[PDB]
Amino acid sequence: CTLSAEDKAAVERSKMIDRNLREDGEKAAREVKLLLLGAGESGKSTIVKQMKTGIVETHFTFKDLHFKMFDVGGQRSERKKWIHCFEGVTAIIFCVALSDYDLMNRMHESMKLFDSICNNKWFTDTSIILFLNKKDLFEEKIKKSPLTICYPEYAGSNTYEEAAAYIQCQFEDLNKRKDTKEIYTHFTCATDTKNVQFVFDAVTDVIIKNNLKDCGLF
Amino acid sequence: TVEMVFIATVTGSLSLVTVVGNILVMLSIKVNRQLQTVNNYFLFSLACADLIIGAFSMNLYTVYIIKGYWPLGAVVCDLWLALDYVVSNASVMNLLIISFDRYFCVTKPLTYPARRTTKMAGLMIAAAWVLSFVLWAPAILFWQFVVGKRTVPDNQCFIQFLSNPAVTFGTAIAAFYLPVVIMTVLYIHISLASRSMAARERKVTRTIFAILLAFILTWTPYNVMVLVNTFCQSCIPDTVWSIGYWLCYVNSTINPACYALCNATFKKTFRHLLLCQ
Amino acid sequence: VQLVESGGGLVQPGGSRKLSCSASGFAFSSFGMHWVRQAPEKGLEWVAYISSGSGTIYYADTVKGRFTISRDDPKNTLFLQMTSLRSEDTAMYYCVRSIYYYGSSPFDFWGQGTTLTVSSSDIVMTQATSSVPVTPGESVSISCRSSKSLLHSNGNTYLYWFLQRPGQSPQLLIYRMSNLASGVPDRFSGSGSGTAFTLTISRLEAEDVGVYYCMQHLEYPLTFGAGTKLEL
Amino acid sequence: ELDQLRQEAEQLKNQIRDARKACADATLSQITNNIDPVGRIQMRTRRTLRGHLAKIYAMHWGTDSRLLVSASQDGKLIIWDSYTTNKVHAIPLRSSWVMTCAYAPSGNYVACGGLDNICSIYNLKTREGNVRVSRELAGHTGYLSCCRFLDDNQIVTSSGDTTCALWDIETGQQTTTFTGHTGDVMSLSLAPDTRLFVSGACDASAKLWDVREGMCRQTFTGHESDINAICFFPNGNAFATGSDDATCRLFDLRADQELMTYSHDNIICGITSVSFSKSGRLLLAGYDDFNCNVWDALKADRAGVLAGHDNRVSCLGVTDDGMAVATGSWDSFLKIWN
Amino acid sequence: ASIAQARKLVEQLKMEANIDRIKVSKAAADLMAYCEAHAKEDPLLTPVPASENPFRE
Known about the structure:
The structure holds five protein chains of five kinds.
Chain B: H1 2-31, H2 40-66, H3 74-107, H4 112-115, H5 118-141, H6 143-147, H7 165-193, H8 198-228, H9 239-244, H10 247-260, H11 264-276
Chain C: E1 3-6, E2 9-11, E3 18-23, E4 34-38, E5 44-50, E6 57-59, E7 68-72, E8 77-81, E9 91-94, E10 114-118, E11 132-133, E12 141-145, E13 159-164, E14 171-174, E15 188-193, E16 196-201, E17 211-216, E18 230-231
Parallel strand pairs in C: 2-10, 11-18
Antiparallel strand pairs in C: 1-3, 3-8, 4-5, 4-9, 5-6, 7-8, 9-10, 12-16, 13-14, 13-17, 15-16
Chain E: H1 4-17, H2 24-36
């Protein structure tokens, strides 16, 4: 054996630390990580309250699956120096305030954030669950003040569903990786209980692609 | 005479293709950390079956068939039949349990992978291997014992229970027809559930096409000839058996390709290996 | 913190009893528990051992197979069942905590022990110092000797030291050769070489009086030494 | 007036550069002339630590050159063993996002902080054997990037916020606050005498802080991009830096200038970790292109390459005796080279 | 910001610029002397055989 009595017990200790480490790694790997990013005061509070300093997480379970919502947007630092810490995150829940177009306008800054996060080298395979909230305020604001102020490229009429789809495809067409990832857009408001069902539907659809890739079918 | 030694060259080239496709993939399973997943153990076992098929079985078969009969010795025929089928059906069972694994990963995306562990996968990757061992391995070496007399001539080399319909259809059903009837519906279910966009579904169908019908077009002619050689013995020429006994092996040699071309990282690691040399 | 052990008493030969201690105050699942006995007028005697999670179970040559040992992590208790108790098994049975990583202090905490009275190629640690008189403020180099080179090829020597005040549980002093366990004053400093060891006390007070046993941990079954009575 | 002070600042910075240029006698490349070359250095992996299951972001050797500590992206923290391959302890973390490690000089404590802006210090040599939080340091506003130990009673932390903090353990509050940087501070390294440390920000400037006084002494500009790694010369009179420019620079603390620029045409990936070997002759660098390097110090010629990983190498560090080096990359395997 | 912060920066830069600096021919010769005085005390520079190496096996 060429090993001492304490050395064999040390190998025993190391081996059961390996077993207890695997018993936690397998448990944590099955949990879904969902990064939540967005703009400042972009309706993150109402959505972190709807689904049940530093990084504040949340553990809300729907249809028997343990989720993780990392709200790292309240960090106020250089986003590019800690964004590599989120490798392997199942999806990035990005939230855009629809009604904040007539408010220095900031949807252009949020668009610049989106095209810098979706084309990042670390988030090539990670899908983005793009949220579009405050649709009730957006509907009224469209009837009040025309939306064409923000987008000189916009040329459509004054229809709610037309403008919503226009900005939806405008955000969707911001990625240079048209195939390696998918964007699951949704419209939501405060009086909506379907957000958690939609995000569960999206995470099932993305773990289908994940395990198809793990077996190397793609 | 000359045409046989001419076709032996391309047969040896195919054997080299098989062995070099297996030697790369089994070492890529181990030396690559990203290919050490619990799902790739089944593929590694398939490669292990494929190496023992390619190195021994088809080469000894060509040695048998270049002369039209076995000149070496009947004791080698009494062992080659046992050695060939136990792994030729082990590959089929492994490729069928991979189909079960994929179906369970698709229709149960979040429960099944959690429910299966290293031991859970091992107790079935060994079960598939031993199913053929407990079905066909005794069926070759004991069927001549139950009668007490040999059925296969010394110069000939073939199955000792190929003739009787109740024992040849019995060994053909669970080896070919059950895998086909299970795999086709499993892949239909996988394709239907993979929809929930167009590009992913299209490539999934284009992949299951090359997975399923490549097995179909390489195991239907041989198995239908197996069923046809039961009560005619004059219906077909005896060289058709030699010609059609290749398709199982071409399936076994394209199995490494059908599972390497699908995965991009397998191509990347093969490129790395050939660059390293 | 405390390791209270329960069981034992006036027993007849052959009778089977279960000696149990209730661990309370540490990670019982991470400590490799032991079982060390002491005859009423003799030195210590190793009995058995359980690793963390019951992975490894060892016994001495005397109790090999005859006694059954076990642990219960959920209840934070340690078990050891006796079978066919004989008059040569009367002893006070101490429960010994032990952890094994690099730089650890095995055999650090010792239980109070249970009173057991039933009516009717090995390492040897030689130490003939007994009934030796000692005066406070002086220096005593308690000699020691083994029958095997405790200097393993892995650098360190697996010899321990222990102290037993009159009427109290044993206490670890020097957890290797030339070390010092926590809660021990720097008065004690070990010094050994090969199969010859001495426990040098630079200056000793009037409270560190007792018997000093040596114990090898190179390989099982963890033989001990004789008593060393330092008389006031 | 803003113009009455920015002009003065520009003039004083010009005077700084003039004073630097006046004291530059000969570049260290000219000083190291006709000197015996090191030659290619053969480096083979001795141990491989296959415990972790996620991305390893930090590492720190001990003072006995015997034990290790690692911070993987999972909620664990393994205190490895170096001569053999075992695990002394495993720490279930309170936050899976960790980028820092610090082994105590006496081995009694381990620091652990990440994106949570909290520095958790773990007690090791404890009765009732288990590793528990000694103190949860709070008072930072950004993510904590690296931890250092002066002793068992003090800790120096560099965080995302434009400041460095020297903490106390008896009371978990700061005692000095090195608020003189702009941009995220990424790395730091203490001195052999533990009186001075330099912190590296994302504004491409390294500032030499004074622990006792709590005030900055020198600032080291002249570097291109954000810098992620700093290690002192063992003499404590120089320090290397590592940036995303794919270039390293060896400064000095008595001339305040640059001595070497460690760049090569074939390398574009930034540096993630820097650690001198003993005697200061070598310069190890943790690059991003799945590879490390060992640069010669006195002459900037590159020694043998150090490639054993397949992912980004985050951290590496030489032992206090100079024996081994442990490269910890984003793959879950450490590698103790020699 | 622009008034008090500017004064704080300028004053600190004054002491950061008044530090006496030495010639490179000395500041680098000192670093050179440390390398040659510790050439033997460098387990990585001179290849140590498997005997003294504690990572031999």
